[PDB]
Amino acid sequence: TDKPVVHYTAPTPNGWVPAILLEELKAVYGGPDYETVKMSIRDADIGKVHNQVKSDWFLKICPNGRIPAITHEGFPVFETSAILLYLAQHFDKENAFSRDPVKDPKGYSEELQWLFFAHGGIGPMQGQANHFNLYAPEKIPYAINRYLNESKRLYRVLDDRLKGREYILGTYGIADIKIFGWARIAPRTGLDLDEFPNVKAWVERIEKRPAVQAGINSCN
Amino acid sequence: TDKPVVHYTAPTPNGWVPAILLEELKAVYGGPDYETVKMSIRDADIGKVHNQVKSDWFLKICPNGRIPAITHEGFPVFETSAILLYLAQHFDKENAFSRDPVKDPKGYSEELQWLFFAHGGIGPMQGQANHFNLYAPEKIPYAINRYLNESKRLYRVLDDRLKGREYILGTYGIADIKIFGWARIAPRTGLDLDEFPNVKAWVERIEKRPAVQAGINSCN
Numbered sequence A, B: 001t002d003k004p005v006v007h008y009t010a011p012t013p014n015g016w017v018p019a020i021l022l023e024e025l026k027a028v029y030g031g032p033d034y035e036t037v038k039m040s041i042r043d044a045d046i047g048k049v050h051n052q053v054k055s056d057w058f059l060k061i062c063p064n065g066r067i068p069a070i071t072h073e074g075f076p077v078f079e080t081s082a083i084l085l086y087l088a089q090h091f092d093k094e095n096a097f098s099r100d101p102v103k104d105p106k107g108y109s110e111e112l113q114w115l116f117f118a119h120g121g122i123g124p125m126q127g128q129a130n131h132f133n134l135y136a137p138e139k140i141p142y143a144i145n146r147y148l149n150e151s152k153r154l155y156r157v158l159d160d161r162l163k164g165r166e167y168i169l170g171t172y173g174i175a176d177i178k179i180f181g182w183a184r185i186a187p188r189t190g191l192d193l194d195e196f197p198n199v200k201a202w203v204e205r206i207e208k209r210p211a212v213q214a215g216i217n218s219c220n
């Protein structure tokens, strides 16, 4: 009775996103279902909790010792954007949320470019902004300013891409889902989404999807 | 003298990597030939040099205003890893350096996972280590140590992956190429590669390849 997909996750800008896609897929195709394994991302739990991202058994699934990761009938996939691509290729047969590499090589490339932009830019830089507010023991203005300025620059790139559209590649798909995990916590990072009104409306359009709520809530 | 790919680049851990793949492809297939446009990545040059990453004309090719980017018969691709994937899909017809998404969905997924690992882990974090240790106008020991330590953690993940192997996914390919651009300057960043002897031997075997040297040199 095991589900075909197991999602190892935590309620975070990265952990929400495969669950969002899984719920979107279910709403369209009727499946697949998934099992959720809630993992500790607290360094104070290292060694002493089985479901903890540094525990060795989990490194066989995600060698980086971070969430999210999935297994699909035993096959492991780590890194948010790679998980989204995997799930789309295996379950999104009508291309509702993703572009086909064979029939749409240029559109597929576009999708990869925006995923990699988020994966190398928004996620890392907004995460460093969060680091220097929440976790660094001292206030370090050089670093706080560096990462807030860089996050603002990246959100301007995103806002400009959203001008004249409702979604990054026109129709809602996995590039929106990846970025949305971070964009919905942008205010708490110190960005003003009212300064990026295309981004703000896009976050609101996605937040109101029932599958998005179900995916976020599955991580709690 | 036809050049169907134009590579907008600079001699940097990201700039080298598409040129390396282009030269690997040229050695196996006899093409594609390419033009190199050397771009200033310096803020001091903004508005003062035509070939500068924040120039409006370039934002039409790379909306993030960073190198590398390519055009292929006019079609733009930005983000190192997305460029590698595009060039592989379009020119690596015998899959000498890359896995096919249709014929090898598992291997293709693994390749994406390691590219995304590098793109969200090694490049961003080693780039921050370089910023604080090498380029910032003030020395901030907390930040230097944070990003040197995180780089070391990421290199330990890579070193353990390379145990028992010569290349990340068995045969040399685009996942190695992506990380190699950063790993070859790890000593400069501040990592002692003797502490990562699998990474060290892997850097050495890749550095010796004539196509690698040709790609690196093309960015000067």
Ligand SMILES: N[C@@H](CCC(=O)N[C@@H](CSSC[C@H](NC(=O)CC[C@H](N)C(=O)O)C(=O)NCC(=O)O)C(=O)NCC(=O)O)C(=O)O
Residues within 6 Å of the ligand: A010, A012, A013, A014, A015, A041, A053, A065, A066, A067, A068, A078, A079, A080, A081, A119, A123, A124, A125, A126, A127, A128, A131, B116, B117, B120, B121
């Ligand atoms: N590139 C990976 C990133 C996954 C990731 O960062 N997972 C986090 C929780 S998401 S919460 C956001 C996360 N922050 C952290 O993980 C903070 C702790 C970390 N050790 C540090 O020192 O920064 C971050 O900034 N991410 C940057 C990015 O997405 O590029 C995790 O498991 N952390 C546990 C641990 O590190 O032990 C992906 O896309 O899947």
Ligand SMILES: N[C@@H](CCC(=O)N[C@@H](CSSC[C@H](NC(=O)CC[C@H](N)C(=O)O)C(=O)NCC(=O)O)C(=O)NCC(=O)O)C(=O)O
Residues within 6 Å of the ligand: A116, A117, A120, A121, B010, B012, B013, B014, B015, B041, B042, B043, B053, B065, B066, B067, B068, B078, B079, B080, B081, B119, B123, B124, B125, B126, B127, B128, B131
């Ligand atoms: N994710 C992109 C990154 C491309 C990139 O960083 N390009 C750099 C040169 S490569 S040199 C390595 C680069 N450092 C820089 O670009 C230093 C300047 C920057 N503004 C800063 O303050 O961080 C870096 O750390 N990159 C992190 C990563 O790869 O994730 C660039 O054009 N800089 C000009 C500019 O910013 O105006 C990719 O993979 O293509």
